[PDB]
Amino acid sequence: YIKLKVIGQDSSEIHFKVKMTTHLKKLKESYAQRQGVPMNSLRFLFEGQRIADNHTPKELGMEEEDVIEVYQE
């Protein structure tokens, strides 16, 4: 497992503990739910590149405490 920090446009953070092999759709959906907006209204970036629903932390090279940025789609 690793902890990822999801940083919003307003500088707020929600952190997620996920498995290295987990498809990140679940993280996207949980974050959008907590922001009260549709998942498709947001885009989630790692090092500026879009995280797909079927990407895993392992595939993206993510490490403990790495940042995911959320932007409006």
Partner: peptide, 10 residues
């Protein structure tokens, strides 16, 4: 003010 820490397990 200052937000508390939020960690969600999936």
């Amino acid at each position: 003010g200052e937000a508390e820490e939020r960690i969600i397990s999936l």
